Design an enzyme around this catalytic site. Structure first.
Site, PDB file in Angstrom:
ATOM      1  N   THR A  85      -3.899  -3.519  -8.220  1.00  0.00           N
ATOM      2  CA  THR A  85      -3.820  -4.953  -7.588  1.00  0.00           C
ATOM      3  C   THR A  85      -3.432  -5.044  -6.202  1.00  0.00           C
ATOM      4  OG1 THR A  85      -1.850  -4.718  -8.715  1.00  0.00           O
ATOM      5  CG2 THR A  85      -3.449  -5.724  -9.983  1.00  0.00           C
ATOM      6  N   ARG A 120      -8.046  -7.602  -6.758  1.00  0.00           N
ATOM      7  CA  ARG A 120      -7.744  -6.460  -7.621  1.00  0.00           C
ATOM      8  C   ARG A 120      -9.099  -5.542  -7.606  1.00  0.00           C
ATOM      9  NH1 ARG A 120      -6.256  -7.304 -13.128  1.00  0.00           N
ATOM     10  NH2 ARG A 120      -5.275  -9.278 -11.768  1.00  0.00           N
ATOM     11  N   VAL A 121      -9.129  -4.088  -8.080  1.00  0.00           N
ATOM     12  CA  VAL A 121     -10.032  -3.341  -8.027  1.00  0.00           C
ATOM     13  C   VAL A 121     -10.310  -2.930  -9.606  1.00  0.00           C
ATOM     14  CG1 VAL A 121     -10.770  -0.877  -7.618  1.00  0.00           C
ATOM     15  CG2 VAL A 121      -9.881  -2.210  -5.799  1.00  0.00           C
ATOM     16  N   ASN A 181      -3.060   4.413  -1.653  1.00  0.00           N
ATOM     17  CA  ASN A 181      -4.352   4.106  -0.923  1.00  0.00           C
ATOM     18  C   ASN A 181      -5.025   5.674  -0.825  1.00  0.00           C
ATOM     19  OD1 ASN A 181      -3.803   1.773  -0.970  1.00  0.00           O
ATOM     20  ND2 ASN A 181      -4.209   1.308   1.161  1.00  0.00           N
ATOM     21  N   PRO A 228     -12.221   9.254  -9.737  1.00  0.00           N
ATOM     22  CA  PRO A 228     -11.765   9.173 -11.020  1.00  0.00           C
ATOM     23  C   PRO A 228     -10.617  10.003 -11.172  1.00  0.00           C
ATOM     24  CG  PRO A 228     -13.565  10.886 -10.690  1.00  0.00           C
ATOM     25  CD  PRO A 228     -13.699   9.994  -9.779  1.00  0.00           C
ATOM     26  N   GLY A 229      -9.939  10.653 -10.191  1.00  0.00           N
ATOM     27  CA  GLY A 229      -8.665  11.408 -10.318  1.00  0.00           C
ATOM     28  C   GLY A 229      -7.370  10.644 -10.019  1.00  0.00           C
ATOM     29  N   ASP A 238      -8.583   3.228   3.252  1.00  0.00           N
ATOM     30  CA  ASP A 238      -8.547   2.261   4.316  1.00  0.00           C
ATOM     31  C   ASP A 238      -9.191   2.895   5.703  1.00  0.00           C
ATOM     32  OD1 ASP A 238      -6.413   0.732   2.679  1.00  0.00           O
ATOM     33  OD2 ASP A 238      -5.315   2.309   3.411  1.00  0.00           O
ATOM     34  N   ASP A 277      -0.593   1.859   9.394  1.00  0.00           N
ATOM     35  CA  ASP A 277       0.222   2.091   8.210  1.00  0.00           C
ATOM     36  C   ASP A 277       0.028   2.921   7.123  1.00  0.00           C
ATOM     37  OD1 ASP A 277      -1.508  -0.002   7.449  1.00  0.00           O
ATOM     38  OD2 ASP A 277       0.081  -1.674   7.536  1.00  0.00           O
ATOM     39  N   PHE A 301      -4.407 -10.125  -2.131  1.00  0.00           N
ATOM     40  CA  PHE A 301      -5.541 -10.935  -2.347  1.00  0.00           C
ATOM     41  C   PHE A 301      -6.689 -10.558  -3.321  1.00  0.00           C
ATOM     42  CE2 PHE A 301      -5.701  -9.027   1.727  1.00  0.00           C
ATOM     43  CZ  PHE A 301      -6.810  -8.061   1.640  1.00  0.00           C
ATOM     44  N   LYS A 315      -0.282   3.796   3.384  1.00  0.00           N
ATOM     45  CA  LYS A 315      -0.001   3.312   2.151  1.00  0.00           C
ATOM     46  C   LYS A 315      -0.433   4.408   1.347  1.00  0.00           C
ATOM     47  CE  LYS A 315      -1.045  -1.138   1.459  1.00  0.00           C
ATOM     48  NZ  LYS A 315      -1.540  -2.311   1.259  1.00  0.00           N
ATOM     49  N   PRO A 316       0.392   5.303   0.790  1.00  0.00           N
ATOM     50  CA  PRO A 316      -0.027   6.390  -0.018  1.00  0.00           C
ATOM     51  C   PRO A 316      -0.732   6.118  -1.496  1.00  0.00           C
ATOM     52  CG  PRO A 316       2.315   6.250  -0.135  1.00  0.00           C
ATOM     53  CD  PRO A 316       1.696   5.257   0.791  1.00  0.00           C
ATOM     54  N   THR A 331       7.011  -3.087   3.195  1.00  0.00           N
ATOM     55  CA  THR A 331       6.804  -1.678   3.007  1.00  0.00           C
ATOM     56  C   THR A 331       7.475  -0.634   4.109  1.00  0.00           C
ATOM     57  OG1 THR A 331       4.538  -1.829   4.316  1.00  0.00           O
ATOM     58  CG2 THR A 331       4.683  -2.164   1.606  1.00  0.00           C
ATOM     59  N   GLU A 359      -4.783   7.867  -8.073  1.00  0.00           N
ATOM     60  CA  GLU A 359      -4.008   7.936  -6.925  1.00  0.00           C
ATOM     61  C   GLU A 359      -3.242   9.027  -6.776  1.00  0.00           C
ATOM     62  OE1 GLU A 359      -1.284   4.212  -6.913  1.00  0.00           O
ATOM     63  OE2 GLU A 359      -3.524   2.928  -6.953  1.00  0.00           O
TER      64      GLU A 359
HETATM   65  N1  LIG Z   1      -4.193   1.566  -4.336  1.00  0.00           N
HETATM   66  C1  LIG Z   1      -5.149   0.504  -3.598  1.00  0.00           C
HETATM   67  C2  LIG Z   1      -5.729  -0.045  -4.572  1.00  0.00           C
HETATM   68  O1  LIG Z   1      -5.142  -0.147  -5.821  1.00  0.00           O
HETATM   69  C3  LIG Z   1      -6.202  -1.610  -4.258  1.00  0.00           C
HETATM   70  C4  LIG Z   1      -5.862  -2.569  -5.527  1.00  0.00           C
HETATM   71  C5  LIG Z   1      -6.409  -3.824  -4.920  1.00  0.00           C
HETATM   72  C6  LIG Z   1      -6.925  -4.086  -3.466  1.00  0.00           C
HETATM   73 CL1  LIG Z   1      -7.017  -5.650  -3.043  1.00  0.00          CL
HETATM   74  C7  LIG Z   1      -6.879  -2.941  -2.755  1.00  0.00           C
HETATM   75  C8  LIG Z   1      -6.563  -1.754  -3.121  1.00  0.00           C
HETATM   76  C9  LIG Z   1      -7.203   0.630  -4.949  1.00  0.00           C
HETATM   77  C10 LIG Z   1      -7.504   1.047  -6.349  1.00  0.00           C
HETATM   78  C11 LIG Z   1      -8.634   2.048  -6.614  1.00  0.00           C
HETATM   79  C12 LIG Z   1      -9.479   2.229  -5.784  1.00  0.00           C
HETATM   80  C13 LIG Z   1     -10.631   2.886  -5.813  1.00  0.00           C
HETATM   81  C14 LIG Z   1     -10.983   3.702  -7.173  1.00  0.00           C
HETATM   82  N2  LIG Z   1     -12.218   4.279  -6.964  1.00  0.00           N
HETATM   83  N3  LIG Z   1     -12.693   3.971  -5.649  1.00  0.00           N
HETATM   84  C15 LIG Z   1     -11.895   3.332  -5.378  1.00  0.00           C
HETATM   85  C16 LIG Z   1      -9.137   1.671  -4.374  1.00  0.00           C
HETATM   86  C17 LIG Z   1      -8.144   1.018  -4.225  1.00  0.00           C
END
Ligand SMILES: [NH3+]C[C@@](O)(c1ccc(Cl)cc1)c1ccc(-c2cn[nH]c2)cc1
Ligand code: NA
EC number: 2.7.11.11
Length: 331
Positions: free
Chosen positions: A36, A41-42, A156, A109-110, A169, A151, A39, A153-154, A182, A112
Site C-alpha cells: 500500500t 496499492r499494488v 522499494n 516473487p521474492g 523507483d 530518497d 495514493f 525507500k528500502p 521518513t 521486499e
Molecule cells: N514497497 C513499495 C510497494 O509496496 C508500493 C505499494 C503501493 C504503491 Cl502506490 C507504490 C509502491 C510495492 C510493492 C510491490 C511491488 C512489486 C511486486 N512485484 N513487482 C513490483 C512494487 C511496489
C-alpha cells in the site's frame, strides 16, 4: 562502461519512440495486495488466459492530484517504460479508467528485501556486498540518464526468483511529506535545504549498507528532530563486527562534506567500486547475473505471495464519471 554507454542510447530511442504493448484491464484477475502507499496499492494479478502473474499498481487519480503527484506519476511511468536495466522493475502494460491509473509491473516473487532482513536480523558482509553492488550499478545507470534516486525507500527494494534486486523507483530529474515522514534516510544536504546532486545517492548507499550489515539504520531516535541532529552531526557508531574495510567505506559514504564524499570525487563511482570492501566483487558477473545469490526465495505455488505481507483489501471502485481527465490525458 560498455553495457551502460549503449543502454543510455537505448533509453533515448525508447523514450522518443515508445512501444504500445496492448493488453486490457479486463484480462487481469485481482488476487491480493502486495503493498500500500499514499495514493494507491499494488495488487498481485493473474492473467486470465495465460495464468501468469503480474504486480498491478493501482493509483487513485484524485488522490494523486490532491497530493500534487501528477507530474511525478506521469514522469515515473515514462521513465519506467523507457528503461531497460536488469535491476529495475519493468512496466508491462498501463491503462486508466474513470477512477484509477493502472500499471502492470513484472512480478518480483521474492518480496521486499527488508522483510528478509528483519527475519534474519542482519546480512553478512558478502550478502550485503552482493546487494550493494546491484544498487551501485543501478545508481550509476540512473546517473547516466541525469536521474537522481534522492530518497531511499528500502521497502522499494524487491527480490526476484533468482535472488537479485529489483528497484521499484527511478528517482527524479533536477515534499515536506518525505522530510517529516521518513527521516532516517535523508542526506544532510537535503535536511539543511541546501543543493543536492548525484551525491545524495551515495549517502543513501551508505545508510543502506549500514542497515543491511547492522540490522538497523545508523541514525535512529524516537522524535524525528533528534534524527536530523544525528544525521548532520557526521557521527556514526559502527558495530564491533563491521570489518575495518566496511567501516572505512561507510565513513567515506556517510561523509557530510560533499566534496570528500565517495562517489562525488574526481574518479566518481570508481572510488566506490575499487574500495577494498568490493575487491571480491565481479562487477561484470553481477551485471550479467552470473553470481549465485545468497538468498533464493521459496516458490511454494504459481501465484505464491507468502514473501509479501498481508494487507486489508479495499474494493477497487470505479466511478461512472471520468475524474481528472485533462490531468492524465498524456498518461
Ligand atoms: N514497497 C513499495 C510497494 O509496496 C508500493 C505499494 C503501493 C504503491 Cl502506490 C507504490 C509502491 C510495492 C510493492 C510491490 C511491488 C512489486 C511486486 N512485484 N513487482 C513490483 C512494487 C511496489
Ligand atoms: Na494532459
Amino acid at each position: 562502461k560498455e553495457f551502460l554507454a549503449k543502454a543510455k542510447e537505448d533509453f533515448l530511442k525508447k523514450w522518443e519512440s515508445p512501444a504500445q504493448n496492448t493488453a486490457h484491464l479486463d484480462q487481469f484477475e485481482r488476487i491480493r495486495t502486495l503493498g500500500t502507499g499514499s495514493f494507491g496499492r499494488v495488487m498481485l494479478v493473474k492473467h486470465k488466459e495465460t495464468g501468469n502473474h503480474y504486480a498491478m499498481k493501482i493509483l487513485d487519480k484524485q488522490k494523486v492530484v490532491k497530493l500534487k503527484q501528477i507530474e511525478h506519476t506521469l514522469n515515473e511511468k515514462r521513465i519506467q517504460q523507457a528503461v531497460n536495466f536488469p535491476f529495475l522493475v519493468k512496466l508491462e502494460f498501463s491503462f486508466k479508467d474513470n477512477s484509477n491509473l493502472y500499471m502492470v509491473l513484472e512480478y518480483a516473487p521474492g518480496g521486499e528485501m527488508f522483510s528478509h532482513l528483519r527475519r534474519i536480523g542482519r546480512f553478512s558482509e558478502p550478502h550485503a556486498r552482493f546487494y550493494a553492488a546491484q544498487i551501485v550499478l543501478t545508481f550509476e545507470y540512473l546517473h547516466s540518464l541525469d536521474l537522481i534516486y534522492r530518497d531511499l525507500k528500502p521497502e522499494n527494494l524487491l527480490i526476484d526468483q533468482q535472488g537479485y534486486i529489483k528497484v521499484a523507483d527511478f528517482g527524479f530529474a533536477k515534499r515536506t511529506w518525505t522530510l517529516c515522514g521518513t527521516p532516517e534516510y535523508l542526506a544532510p544536504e537535503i535536511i539543511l535545504s541546501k543543493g543536492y546532486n548525484k551525491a545524495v545517492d551515495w549517502w543513501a548507499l551508505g545508510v543502506l549498507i549500514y542497515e543491511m550489515a547492522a540490522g538497523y539504520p545508523p541514525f535512529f531516535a524516537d522524535q524525528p528532530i533528534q534524527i536530523y541532529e544525528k544525521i548532520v552531526s557526521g557521527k556514526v557508531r559502527f558495530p564491533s563486527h563491521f570489518s575495518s574495510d566496511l567501516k572505512d567505506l561507510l565513513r567515506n559514504l556517510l561523509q557530510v562534506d560533499l566534496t570528500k564524499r565517495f562517489g562525488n570525487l574526481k574518479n566518481g563511482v570508481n572510488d566506490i567500486k575499487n574500495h577494498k570492501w568490493f575487491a571480491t566483487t565481479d562487477w561484470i558477473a553481477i551485471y550479467q547475473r552470473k553470481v549465485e545469490a545468497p538468498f533464493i526465495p521459496k516458490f511454494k505455488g504459481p501465484g505464491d505471495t507468502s514473501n509479501f505481507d498481508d494487507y486489508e483489501e479495499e474494493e477497487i471502485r470505479v466511478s461512472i464519471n471520468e475524474k481528472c481527465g485533462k490531468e492524465f490525458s498524456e498518461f
